[PDB]
């Protein structure tokens, strides 16, 4: 989703065709750290926001195609907004800054 290559906002499960009531139908009663790719509309139409819900603080999360930069950056240089986030999905995102306190459970891939 920027030049002809396609992997960050649209990676493996990263779809964005799920809105407010249809995301809630398989979400916030069970959800304690499940991360899944939600359609927005606010600054016109926002197709690639990501949404994880923790049952308590239920709170969405922005992507962006390849803009974040996390890894050993000399010969192969790193540019990924998920690589900074995935380090703290390995443990607890409240030790980052966002008050979620969650590990990776399971993505809702194509509903």
């Amino acid at each position: 989703g920027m030049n002809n290559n396609m992997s960050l906002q649209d990676a493996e499960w990263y779809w964005g065709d799920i809105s407010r009531e249809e995301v809630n139908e398989k979400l916030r009663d069970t959800a304690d750290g499940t991360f899944l790719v939600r359609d927005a509309s606010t600054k016109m139409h926002g197709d690639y926001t990501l949404t994880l819900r923790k049952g308590g603080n239920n709170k969405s999360i922005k992507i962006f195609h390849r803009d974040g930069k996390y890894g050993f950056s000399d010969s192969l240089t790193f540019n990924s907004v998920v690589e900074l986030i995935n380090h703290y999905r390995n443990e607890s995102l409240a030790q980052y800054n966002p008050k979620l306190d969650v590990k990776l459970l399971y993505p809702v891939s194509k509903y």
């Binding site: 407010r20 995301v23 809630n24 979400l27 916030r28 927005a40 606010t42 926002g46 926001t49 819900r53 603080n57 239920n58 709170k59 969405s60 999360i61 922005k62 992507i63 962006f64 974040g68 907004v81 986030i85 966002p98």
Partner: peptide, 8 residues
Amino acid sequence: SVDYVPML
């Protein structure tokens, strides 16, 4: 709060 919070 189930809509939109743009974190990155």
